Structure formats: structure tokens, C-alpha cells
Design a protein around this ligand. Structure first.
Ligand SMILES: Cc1ncc(COP(=O)(O)O)c(/C=N/[C@@H](C[C@@H]2C(=O)Nc3ccccc32)C(=O)O)c1O
Ligand SMILES: Cc1ncc(COP(=O)(O)O)c(/C=N/[C@@H](C[C@@H]2C(=O)Nc3ccccc32)C(=O)O)c1O
Ligand SMILES: O=P(O)(O)OC[C@@H](O)CO
Ligand SMILES: O=P(O)(O)OC[C@@H](O)CO
Ligand code: NA
Ligand code: NA
Lengths: 396, 267, 396, 267
């Protein structure tokens, strides 16, 4: 029994070992209680405004749409404390953890962005935080690792498997299955078993709510489409949620194409995978013919995940949202273009969304369209990755 | 059927069941078959067998490495089912249970998976990441193919869950020793008499305790507490691991361990 | 002749080569015209709000004042686009440059923060930007250098002298003295010749204006004191300006003490230097008995400057503002404390101000006081410097 | 006084002044004094001498390195004034002008600085970073100590500035060839006849053109355009630099260069 529907059509559920079902049911109950509690809502709002910096700006691009009939706004989650949208939902989940009497936090990370967010929220709110991170991401993201440790978090490299996000997820779940009595698992995306896809959406939906108010104020109408990258689905569903019932507003999610879909080295399960059961959920995933989970690939560690949240799978199935992919090289060009022409260094994750918007503009330059891209994070963490690429291609 | 006949015979002899677990194909197909024949010949009352899975989220490092060894030898689910058929041809009465991860069951159709289990002579299936709340299509397919669906009684079980497991489960009930993942180093110490008693009141299938069972004292303790038997996996797998380069000595030490564990089940 | 008073008491002036006086007079005139122009004010406000992210949060500390009668707020300039207060005044100066018909920008930087700000504003507004940076700061701040170049700026290492900020300043001025016809010198602090100290203050005073409104809203009264680090003086005068006439509000500026004032290795000219003429101004500076300019030192490259803006010298002389110093080690402890207890990684510059606030609290823990620290920037740029220190002291 | 007497004598001979500049104490005190005696003996009509300063913001690399060499030899302002006194004892009629940075003048008191200039026999002081708008205490101190305050006429001069320089300046007017900083590689090419004419109309002190003058053709061109003379610094300093390890050849090449530059001033 659950208080809330665990499925979006066929997708979702609670495919966890029996031992963890009490933890999931307790979390759902705490969340439903919290959502009706004015005191919880007031504390969450206070943290979002006065600690994290909400509302975030909606920036009209001045130079990158020149010569076209596209108007492009960027929703500036890059300006949130910590550098990405992740901070929104970690503040809510940390408050839920306290509401339940939990003193410790488990989290996984790939971009190190959710790790940083979990570490900062735990520091503020007095929780003991341990973060699992693929050891390949460890040796590549040593700066973010040190940030987490500076803020008092334990960072645990994971060497198994691809040594990336999927493997960090596995270890976090193994941990939480012998520590759920005292530790809250702070899942970092809108995926995993119910109630996480629902909680993460509700704690990210201020993105789209703000965007809607801001666009009505500046343009007097809703966007023709909103565009967001999709690694697990949190920033996209946060932007999408408040527009789902606005049927004229397109919802476009951008999965990583990596080296190219045809190479098999990508992270685009929603359009190029097959439904399966893992990560506690029934959802599209990259898998072999035998049902083994395949390793994903992206230049962006935050999108390097071979599954996707169930609400996106559902929104795609019914045609409410459309999903596309963008390759490493297309993402890199968008990163460079935003740096040089708007003075904003975007996360390589977010650069996938920008890259698709640029394509919509350049492919049909006389099409009048009002677009919003969710700039889910800043690209400070990515400048070394980008440098080593530009140096290897003789471009610097 | 096989579980009912085993437990009736063990009850007559005032014995508990000792049920080893191994990963099929670890370290190879041929050595795995020899390993399983040795476990039976040394006193195994039943078998629990895992199909190598890419992401075993309920297993600790010992059984993770067993899966990796199986994958290194190229073991696929299809090859696992060919092994299962051969094991059933050798051993017509021993109950054979699979410990599966959900995606391998769901991949090419739940019904097709259980149909293949029936074809090869499997007796039960436990899907580690399918709780009773999600089990409907799995247990229906199992029962449709004369396969017992196994459910887990965790140490935090409440009464509504007790009644569900007792009602929907067949063959045996998996009584968890402790929270966490599989592993011999972590011994379950929490008393389980209360759960064992409730399961019996609700007419659940007989309980086999698993997780952390690595010594004969733990086997006798589970039997003494009312459990019908005990399952040991990581303890068995570490012997395989320790002896990879010495196949003969591996079988020797496996027999020594199994015999002692089964001896402790003779209450 | 000037439109505005170039001196604050004895300090200030326009001590530049005659050739540059026309450029200074033109800039003053453009600034006075701009300040009366509603269209300029509207464009500046639009950029500040919708591009840079103003207003910034005022964050009440939750944990670091526990056990005391101090209430401590942080003015979150770390959340501004670019990561520091520098972005405020570069947007105004870039608009002035366009108002004057200039197409190129010269700027100096030490923290690389003003460099990043100049580069991002130039990218947005279509200006060609060249940045001078001490070559020692170059080899230490290669990440920020790459950010600037990513955004299309030319970064020029300076090897002369101490190879730090003073030397970058020298080269920028030498450059601007053969390029003033087409290049605007975007000075990065409230120092240098008139009109820069006045312009930079007016384009930073939203910091204190916002702070005042925010504190009245949250506490119903003005702060007992506001505290800011002082390298050249921009972030401090920006916080101070709107409180100058609120005589009950203390104004506390914190100069870098480096290894200790007694060692001579510091950047505290206002309290430990001697009035002189250089950098285009009459102001306190660190100098030998013979009047040679001495090299400064701080762990923080953004505070490593052997002079200070003239308005601070004046406010000190008349006793309106008080100036203190904080050593490297005190700044480092404050950095660590904010990371671990509030989940905010501060700039090492700003950590000097926090360190003095912590001292005011800890020295007199039963003194009831409402304090505001200007958190002038985020400390992302400093995590490697801090790491190499903690590793050298066996602390990691 | 010395400038008035020089320019009257040069006017009689229909000659322009050639005025070399060096940094005092570059590369050392003793070689610098020999250098200055050589510049005079080879035809220098006047001298412009710099006091090494830690941050010379109007100088390019050549004169920056001259200052560094002087500092390497431990040259201080006090030692510079002892040199100036000795130079004046050797050469009673040649005008001696200082090119100063403001902080060295202001350091221990503006009045004390000009008093010391008077004591050693200096004729004029140009403070490079003190525009006419800031000059009041400097020019008052200079005139009080019978020192000519020198002001710069930049190529972007407007009429109000022309009248100010003509009114407040004494001795000579520094006519800038171009924008930028000192340096022989950068030649000023903008015609300056218009400024020269206005200065004469307003009765300014005679104009000496400086910055980028490194060839005899530039000296004759400035004289031909109406300037009373030309100043050359970086060109002279590069000879010092090129010959640091060959003190004798240095003096030889300095004399060769000065003689040719002074020859071109004889219009
Ligand atoms: C700036 C920025 N933008 C977009 C995204 C994409 O995430 P979404 O698809 O959900 O929107 C990220 C990603 N961040 C994460 C990964 C995130 C996480 O934390 N757990 C988890 C589990 C499965 C998949 C993805 C995740 C990280 O590397 O820490 C990002 O950092
Ligand atoms: C985050 C942060 N906080 C405080 C400060 C301190 O500056 P203020 O004293 O003026 O407040 C900085 C500093 N930044 C600068 C230095 C700044 C500049 O740009 N030119 C210049 C010239 C002389 C002195 C100082 C400067 C940089 O290294 O680029 C900072 O980066
Ligand atoms: O590995 P252990 O800890 O013995 O657990 C049993 C498990 O492997 C089979 O169900
Ligand atoms: O160095 P140059 O370019 O000759 O300029 C003259 C200057 O050095 C003395 O006034
Ligand atoms: Na994905
Ligand atoms: Na300073």
C-alpha cells in the first residue's frame, strides 16, 4: 500500500529488496505530511530564498540568436548556491531527513554537483554525509571531491564496473540497505524507486513555476517550448512540471549522444534503450540482448547514466514530451558559443540542452519561436575537461 | 513436490536443511558443475543458484566477484539454463531454487522466463529486487509454470507483511538474518524466534535463514530457533575464490565445509 | 577643472601623465551624464537583475554564532554571476565605455575575479578585452586565465616586479596611455585617479542599499556594524556607502595581515603604510624610507596590493570607519569554519572579513551585536591554494 | 639663468639643442658619471636625468631595465643627489633637468625635495605623473627654490591647456611626440607644427620634443618644425645596455651617437 501512485503508466514502481520497503513507505508518509505542513513549507522557502538564492534570473540571450526569429531565454539555475539546480531538492530532502529523525545522509554523484549539494546541505543542517562517486569520476573531479571534504563530507571512490555514476548508485543502495535506520538516502535525480521520482519533481518544480511567471512578465505569453538536458531527469522535470497542463508548450528533453548513437557510446536510453527493471524502478535502460545493464558514455559525467526517470518515459510514451540527443561535439560547440557570446560558462550537462536549442534556431532561422533552455548548472567544474579536449584537438 | 517432500523427510529425521548457494558458472561452466555435484555429495539438502547479473545490488564483494568470474568465462543466462537442465538430469529429487535479479526475469518476458524454469526442472524462484508489493505478475507466472515463488521475511517485518508472505509464498520462506547485503564477515545477531513463530502460525512455507551464515554454530542456532534450515553463500564462494588456481583442492575444501555445516543441521 | 570633487580630504586626485587627463575628464563627464539618464539606469538595472542575478541574498548564519549573543548575516555577493561583487561595476563601466564610443577594454586582475568579470561583460556587450595579470598569478590561477580566454579575452602575463597585482596595474596604465582613444581602462577597484574611486563606489553601492533594506525587513533595525575586506576598496565602499550617514552603524574594513604585520609581509597600507603618490592617486601605500613602492603580500591574491582607495583613507582619518588586519592563518580558519558549518565556500579575500567578525564574536561572546559581513566572492578559485596549504601542514 | 642662456646662445648660432636622457647610476655610480661626462663632451647642450624609481609607469622596457640596473648597484635618491652635485661642480653652465616620479618628490616633503635640488644646482624638474591640474604645490616649491617647473604639452593638448602650460612653465616646454610610454622603437609621426606655433604665440618656454627620438633625421625634423631642441633617452640607454660588459666601448659608442645627433641639430 502507498499513499501516492508509484507508477507513471507502465513505468516506475518500487523494485527494491523487501528490507527497504519500510524506509520507502516512511519517506512517502513524511513527504505527504510535509507537503501539507505550513511550517515545513515556510522553512523550505526560507532556505531556498535566503540561503540558496531563489528566485533565479531568466536571462534573454542578446547575441546568440542574432539573424534569426528565435528568442531564447536561459533559466539561470547556474546562479543557485552550489552552482546547479541540485541544491533545490537536497534542501527539501535534508529537511525531510530531519523530520524523520535521521542523522546521516548517503548520496551518489557523478558530476560531483549532487555531491557538493548534499555536502553543503548536510553542513548547514547538521547531518553526517557520505558520498559515493565512481573512482574514475574521483580521479577526474578531484576539485569537487575536495570541496565536499572541505564541507565535512566523506567521499568514497567506487572502482567497480564502469567506475562512474551507475556504480556509485549501486554502492549507495547497498549501503542504505544496511543503514536505513539512521541514514537517509538522498537520491540525486528524479529516478529510483517511488517515492523519489515524485519527491524530486515536487522539490524542483519551482524552476518551471518561476520560469512561467518570468516569461509572462517579460513576453506576455508562454514559451513555444522549454528545453532541458536529461541524465536522470530532475532538472528537466523541474522545468517541465508546471507546463505539463499547458498543452501548447513543447517539452523537449535532451539525452547525451556521446560519440554518436550509432557507436553505442552514449547515454540515451529513453530513445535508444529498452524497458527493464533496475535502480529500483521499471524504466528504459541501456541493456544487452540478455538483459545485462550496459555502460553508458558521455563527455558529461552528470549525464553518464544508462537509465532515466519513469515520468519522462511516460511523458514520451503519450507524446506530451519529445526527447532528442546531442553528441559530445555538439555540446562542446554550444559551451564555447555561450562563453564567447553571452559571457556565461555553462555546465557540460546544460550545454546539451543549449546545443539542441541552437539547432532549432539554426535549422529554421526564419521560424518565429520563443524558447527557454534550463541552464541547469555552471561550467566551472568542466574547464579542465574542456581544456584537455581543446589542447588535444590543436585548438589551443 | 520437491520442497514439500524434502521438508517432510527432514522433519521425520529431526533435521534441518543445509542449503548452499553458488553463482552458476563460477569460475567456469565445467568447474561449476563439478562444484555443485560436490556440494550435493557432501550433504546439501537443496540448492540455491544465482544467475550472473551485471549489477547485483543485494550482494557484497564476495558474490560480486563470483559474478565477475562467471562473466570472464563468458557465462550467459542461456548457458545457465543448460547447466540447470543437466543438474536436474543428475539429481531428480533435490530442490533447485534460483536467486534472480528482476531484469533477467523481465528481459524477454516474465512468462517466458518461468516457462524455461519449468522446462529445465527448477523448483522455486526468488527475485531479489521484487518485493511482495510488486510481485503479482511474477508469482502468477511462477505458479502457472509450477514454480514456487519465494518471498523474503526481513527482520523488520510487520504483521501485514507476515500474512502476505505466508499467503503468497510457496516452497520455503527466506528468513533474512540481518539488514545489509550478502557477506560472510557480517553475522546476523538479532533473535528471530518471534518471526519464525508468526510464520508458523500463519502457515507460511518453512523458513530458511540466510545472510551471514558461515559457521556450523550458526546453522545449529537457526535450527534450534525453529528455522527449517539455513542457506550459506559467501562462505562457499570464498572457498572457490581462495582456490581458483587449485581446482582439486577447491572441491576438497568445499566438501569439508559442506559436510560440517550439514552435520550441524542434524539437531 | 572637474565636474566632481576628486579628493576625499587630502586623499585622491588625478596624478597621471598629462596625456591621460582628457580620457579622465571624458569619463567623468560620461559618468555624470549617465547617472542622470533614465535609459542608462534602466539598462544597468536590467543587466544587474536579469543577467547578473541581483538582488543577492542576505543569509543569516545558523551555526557559527551558536553559544554567543552575536547575530551574523552574510551579504551573498558570492551568488552574483561570475562569483564575486566585481560583476556589478564592470557592467556599469562597460556601458559607459559604449556610451563613449570605445570598442576595447583594458583591465588588470590579481584574483582573476575582476579579469573574469571584465571578460564576461565584454563578451556580452561586444567589446574586445585584454587583461594584465602578474605572471606569478598566471601560473597560480591558470583555471581563471582559461575562463577569461574561453570568454574571448586576451590574458597577458606580467613578469616585472613582484609579478602580482601592482605590476599588472602598472602595465595596464602603460597600455592605456598609448591606447586611450579606442580602449577604456576598466579599473577593478575603488582606487586610482579620479573619477574611478567615485564611479566604482556608485556602481557598487547597491550592495549596501540592498543590505539595509534586507536587514530592516528581517531584524527591524540597522546593523551594529558592517564588515568587509579591503584590497583596493570596492566591495567595502559598496557595502559602506549607504550607511555612511547612519552614524550608529559601524564600518569595519579588514586589510590582509599576511604572515603578520611585524614581518613586513602584509597588505595593510591604510594602517601600516605612509601617504604617497602612485597609481594615479594620493593614498596610503607601503613604501621604503626613500619612497620606493614596497611589494605587498597576502595568501589572497585579490588583497595583494600595497595601496588602498582614497575614500577609505579619508573615512579612517575622520574616524567614521575603523580598519583592522587579519593574517593568512586567521583567514584560513574562517574559510574552513564557513565551509564546515554553513556549507559556503568563501573567497579567501572575503574570509578575511569573516575572520574579523568571528573574532568580534569570540572575544566578547555575551555582547549582543548584529553584524553583516560582505561575502564578496565564492572560493572556488581558491580550493587548490587551500589544498596545497593543508597538505603541507599535515592536515590532509 | 641656465636655460635662458642656452637658448639665447643656440638661437644666435641657428642651432637646436640636443638633450640626452639617462638614468642616474645606470649601470653604476662611477660609470654613470663617466657616461654623463662623455655625453657633454660629445655635444650635449643640456641634460635630462632620471632618479631610479620602483614603478616607472611612463617608461617602456628599456628605461625600466635601466632603473633595475641602478637598483642592482644600490643607487638611492640620496646617492643621486651626490652625483648631481658633482656633475654641477664639473659643468657650471649646462642646464640640468630632472625627470622625477611624484612619490620621490613628495616622500619626505615637496619643499625639502626642491630645496635639495637648489643645493646641488639643478635647473628644472619635470614630475611625470603630476599634471598641471595637480601642480600647485610642486610649481610653488620649485619657483621658491629657483627651480624651473617643467610641464608637458601632449599631442592631444587643447587651448586651455596650451595657455596653462605657457603660463606656469619655465625653462623649457616638454613637447610629447606621441602617446604611449618612452621607447626608441616607437617613432612619433604626428605633425606638431600647430602646437609649436601656439606655444610661441602664448610665450611658452621653448619646446623640446621627446619620446621616440632615436635618429638624427628625427632631431633635424623637430628643429625644422620649430622646436628648440630634442630629447633622446631610450636610444642612449640601449647603448649602455648593449655594452654593459664593455665599459670602454660603451663610452665610445655613446660619443659616436651623441655627436651625430647633435650634428643634426645644427640647422
Ligand atoms: C549541472 C547538472 N545538470 C544536469 C544534470 C543531469 O541531471 P538530471 O538529468 O537529473 O537533470 C546534472 C547531473 N548531476 C549529477 C547526476 C545526477 C545525480 O546527482 N544522481 C544521478 C543518478 C542518475 C542520473 C543522474 C544523476 C551528478 O553528477 O552529480 C548536473 O550536475
Ligand atoms: C572576491 C574578492 N573580494 C574582495 C576583493 C578585494 O577587492 P576590494 O578591496 O576592492 O574590495 C577581491 C579582489 N579582486 C581583485 C583585485 C582588485 C582588482 O580587480 N584590481 C585591483 C587593484 C588594486 C587592488 C585590488 C584590486 C582581483 O584579484 O581580480 C576579490 O576578488
Ligand atoms: O552470502 P551470504 O551472506 O551467505 O547470504 C546468502 C546468499 O548469498 C544466498 O541467498
Ligand atoms: O626614451 P625616449 O623614447 O627617447 O623618451 C625620452 C625620455 O626617455 C626622456 O624624457
Ligand atoms: Na540517462
Ligand atoms: Na591594499
Amino acid at each position: 500500500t502507498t499513499l501516492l501512485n508509484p507508477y507513471f503508466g507502465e513505468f516506475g514502481g518500487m523494485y527494491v529488496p523487501q528490507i527497504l520497503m519500510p524506509a520507502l513507505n516512511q519517506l512517502e508518509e513524511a513527504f505527504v505530511s510535509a507537503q501539507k505542513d505550513p511550517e515545513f513549507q515556510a522553512q523550505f522557502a526560507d532556505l531556498l530564498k535566503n540561503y540558496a538564492g531563489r528566485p533565479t534570473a531568466l536571462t534573454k540571450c542578446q547575441n546568440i540568436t542574432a539573424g534569426t526569429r528565435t528568442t531564447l531565454y536561459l533559466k539561470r539555475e547556474d546562479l543557485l548556491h552550489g552552482g546547479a539546480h541540485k541544491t533545490n531538492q537536497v534542501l527539501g530532502q535534508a529537511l525531510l531527513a530531519k523530520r524523520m529523525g535521521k542523522s546521516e545522509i548517503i548520496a551518489e554523484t557523478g558530476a560531483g554537483q549532487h555531491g557538493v549539494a548534499s555536502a553543503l546541505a548536510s553542513a548547514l543542517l547538521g547531518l553526517k554525509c557520505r558520498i559515493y562517486m565512481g573512482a574514475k569520476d574521483v580521479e577526474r573531479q578531484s576539485p569537487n571531491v575536495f570541496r565536499m571534504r572541505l564541507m565535512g563530507a566523506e567521499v568514497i571512490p567506487v572502482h567497480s564496473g564502469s567506475a562512474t555514476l551507475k556504480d556509485a548508485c549501486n554502492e549507495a543502495l547497498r549501503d542504505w540497505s544496511g543503514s536505513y535506520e539512521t541514514a537517509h538516502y538522498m537520491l540525486g535525480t528524479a529516478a529510483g524507486p517511488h517515492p523519489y521520482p515524485t519527491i524530486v519533481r515536487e522539490f524542483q518544480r519551482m524552476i518551471g513555476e518561476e520560469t512561467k511567471a518570468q516569461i509572462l512578465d517579460k513576453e506576455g505569453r508562454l514559451p513555444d517550448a522549454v528545453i532541458a538536458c536529461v541524465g536522470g531527469g530532475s532538472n528537466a522535470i523541474g522545468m517541465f512540471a508546471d507546463f505539463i497542463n499547458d498543452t501548447s508548450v513543447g517539452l523537449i528533453g535532451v539525452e547525451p549522444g556521446g560519440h554518436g548513437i550509432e557507436t553505442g557510446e552514449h547515454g540515451a536510453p529513453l530513445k535508444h534503450g529498452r524497458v527493464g527493471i533496475y535502480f529500483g524502478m521499471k524504466a528504459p535502460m541501456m541493456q544487452t540482448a540478455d538483459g545485462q545493464i550496459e555502460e553508458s558514455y558521455s563527455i558529461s559525467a552528470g549525464l553518464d547514466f544508462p537509465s532515466v526517470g519513469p515520468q519522462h518515459a511516460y511523458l514520451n510514451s503519450i507524446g506530451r514530451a519529445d526527447y532528442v540527443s546531442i553528441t559530445d561535439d555538439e555540446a562542446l560547440e554550444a559551451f564555447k558559443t555561450l562563453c564567447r557570446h553571452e559571457g556565461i560558462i555553462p555546465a557540460l550537462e546544460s550545454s546539451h540542452a543549449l546545443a539542441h536549442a541552437l539547432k532549432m534556431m539554426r535549422e529554421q532561422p526564419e521560424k518565429e519561436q520563443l524558447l527557454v533552455v534550463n541552464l541547469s548548472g555552471r561550467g566551472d567544474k568542466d574547464i579542465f575537461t574542456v581544456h584537455d579536449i581543446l589542447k588535444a584537438r590543436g585548438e589551443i | 513436490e520437491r520442497y514439500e517432500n524434502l521438508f517432510a523427510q527432514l522433519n521425520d529425521r529431526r533435521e534441518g536443511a543445509f542449503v548452499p548457494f553458488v553463482t552458476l558458472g563460477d569460475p567456469g561452466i565445467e568447474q561449476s558443475l563439478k562444484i555443485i555435484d560436490t556440494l550435493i555429495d557432501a550433504g546439501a539438502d537443496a540448492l540455491e543458484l544465482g544467475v550472473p547479473f551485471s549489477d547485483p545490488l543485494a550482494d557484497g564483494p564476495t558474490i560480486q566477484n563470483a559474478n565477475l568470474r562467471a562473466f570472464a568465462a563468458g557465462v550467459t543466462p542461456a548457458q545457465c539454463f543448460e547447466m540447470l537442465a543437466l543438474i536436474r538430469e543428475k539429481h531428480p529429487t533435490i530442490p533447485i531454487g534460483l536467486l534472480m535479479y528482476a531484469n533477467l526475469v523481465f528481459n524477454n518476458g516474465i512468462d517466458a522466463f518461468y516457462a524455461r524454469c519449468e522446462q529445465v526442472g527448477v523448483d522455486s524462484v526468488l527475485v531479489a529486487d521484487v518485493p511482495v508489493e510488486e510481485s503479482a505478475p511474477f508469482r502468477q507466472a511462477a505458479l502457472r509454470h509450477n514454480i514456487a515463488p519465494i518471498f523474503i521475511c526481513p527482520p523488520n517485518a510487520d504483521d501485514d507483511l507476515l500474512r502476505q508472505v505466508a499467503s503468497y509464498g510457496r516452497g520455503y520462506t527466506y528468513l533474512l538474518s540481518r539488514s545489509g547485503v550478502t557477506g560472510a564477515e557480517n553475522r546476523g545477531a538479532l533473535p528471530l524466534h518471534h518471526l519464525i513463530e508468526k510464520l508458523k502460525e500463519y502457515h507460511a512455507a518453512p523458513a530458511l535463514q540466510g545472510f551471514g551464515i558461515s559457521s556450523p554454530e550458526q546453522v545449529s542456532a537457526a535450527v534450534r530457533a525453529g528455522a527449517a534450515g539455513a542457506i550459506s553463500g559467501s562462505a562457499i564462494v570464498k572457498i572457490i575464490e581462495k582456490n581458483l588456481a587449485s581446482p582439486k583442492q577447491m572441491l576438497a575444501e568445499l566438501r569439508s565445509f559442506v559436510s560440517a555445516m550439514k552435520a550441524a543441521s542434524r539437531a
